[PDB]
Amino acid sequence: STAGKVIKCKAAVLWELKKPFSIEEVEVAPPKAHEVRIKMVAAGICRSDEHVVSGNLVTPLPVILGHEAAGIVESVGEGVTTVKPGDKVIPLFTPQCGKCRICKNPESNYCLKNDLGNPRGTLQDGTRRFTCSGKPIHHFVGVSTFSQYTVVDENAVAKIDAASPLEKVCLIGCGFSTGYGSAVKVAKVTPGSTCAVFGLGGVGLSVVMGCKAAGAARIIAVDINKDKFAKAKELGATECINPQDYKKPIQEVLKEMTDGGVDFSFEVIGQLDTMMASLLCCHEACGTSVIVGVPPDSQNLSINPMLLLTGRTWKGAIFGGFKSKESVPKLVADFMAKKFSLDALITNVLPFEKINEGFDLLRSGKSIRTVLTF
């Protein structure tokens, strides 16, 4: 029907930095061997997408952004055995080939098939499936979900519960899993511990959720926008602090509130100064600090090695440390079992065609997650 044929649809293309997305008519090639073409149903707006627009996260242009989403399999290529047409799925910006050193290591998830580190803007075979007015369009982190139809590698697509509400579970595609996992899986927050969370957007709030789920005694939420505090409290924050209210640097305020520092700190903003503050705020002898935020391209931190010699542990992670393919289905299963809710994270719902308004909402600081419906 459309199987084996090229599909003509709409997609939000970014042709230039700092410019609005352009809803364009695009051609989506049929899926090659071990590939899956997906009809998108819902896509969340994550700060990382915006990082590309602003120039903070470098990627080849023109490109179709979007990586937090959920859809339904339209067709599959030769050899596909994990999903079938009609299956509800969530694309994985961090693939899980299952065969590489990293996929085989129980404690890691940054699969060697990824396109995050040194962006090619292509699928795993090094080619593109998108075209627009005679111009090829680059993919984004292997998924390009801001399109009515996208084609992805089989190891970058997870099959989920058939009764799943895609307009909600799409957050498991990035935001929620990243934040939740950063606390429960990466930092391995312990019951009775003290945590400091920098940044209260969709990812940071999911970190607050993770810390509460891990049984943290104190979860101090840090954010320069006091409007983000109510939600942080509802989700588990015991205290909310605004750096702008203090004469002292935020790390010193945090250390004074916590007997020398927190046991676990998380930077969920993407700024060098806040990464430094987060490291400095965890206790020098027993603190752990996790970098979640994506820093601006080519910018380096200035760190004194003594900060680590006394006993600190500094680490970072992509997608909360979750091995994508095996984890996403389980997270959806937990959601269906009502282990956690994502309603608090969805502040706005807009049709895909109003993607620009969704980004305006993010930039304004009012929204957490705006979900786009196709």
Place this chain on the structure above:
Amino acid sequence: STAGKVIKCKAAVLWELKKPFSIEEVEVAPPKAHEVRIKMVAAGICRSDEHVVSGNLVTPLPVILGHEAAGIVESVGEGVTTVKPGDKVIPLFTPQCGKCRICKNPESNYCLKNDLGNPRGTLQDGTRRFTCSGKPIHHFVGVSTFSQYTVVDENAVAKIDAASPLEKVCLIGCGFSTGYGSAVKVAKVTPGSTCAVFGLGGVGLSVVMGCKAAGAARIIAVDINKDKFAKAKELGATECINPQDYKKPIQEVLKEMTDGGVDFSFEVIGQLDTMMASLLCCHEACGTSVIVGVPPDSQNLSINPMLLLTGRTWKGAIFGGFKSKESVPKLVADFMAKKFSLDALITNVLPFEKINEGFDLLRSGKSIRTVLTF
């Protein structure tokens, strides 16, 4: 006898930086209620003592250095209950007050009573027990072991096996414990993993021993002094490489030898470039890098947060993460049960009077650990 009296004894005093130690008579005050005066038997020469001489590690002068040692208790304060005159003990440069947040924490060891962070060069009560030519002399990390007699706080001295050969077990006071601990307790090296060890001095070779004890499949010893290779191999290194032998950076040489990088890397030198090579040489997705070497004073590293974001863990530790007072006696009991050997680490034994000569040996790279006899 000497109990309750001032003792005039020989000590090695450092009056100025980059100058030989001055061997002379000093007056050592009796210990206070919770202090212990120790007659030194053996003291090891560690690179950290040299860091003070060179100016790399800042501490107030004039000072009596030394921190890796073993002696016999001459007298104790009336409040002392853990050691008695005649007991063989090892002074702990990292104390274990047992009452602070850190001492209560089963996973940390950087007791808040330490004098490592911002050196006062005194005992815990803020005063000094040393005088020479009338002038007060500063202590070093609360222990100052380069003296025939020293006075230390009770929580900074551990009672060890009475049958212990002090000329060997003094290494448990720093070098060995630090190296072994860094691998087994800090990095928590796992069976079948790959490790890279930067620096093959007494501490680095002990890290090799720890990696071996942990069952590492590969232990790549790195050093620009090829004379250290035979011993690295004897202690467990599977391979030995010299950075100077290659045209490309050592981190790339290591990554090419280990499928993208080692699982665990350790810097046991104290230089910025090697701390960077060490971080860069562990796999970006599953590697853990431990800082053991003491960095040069007032110097920063320039790091791109993405090095951590992909999945690396970067941490540091003091004294191999061992809670000093409870661990030192057990480590000696292990030595006495022949669970590990220290012979290979001791390459030179000189009388205390030849301390300057022992330091020249370290500087020339001709020795691993030189032990001084009193």
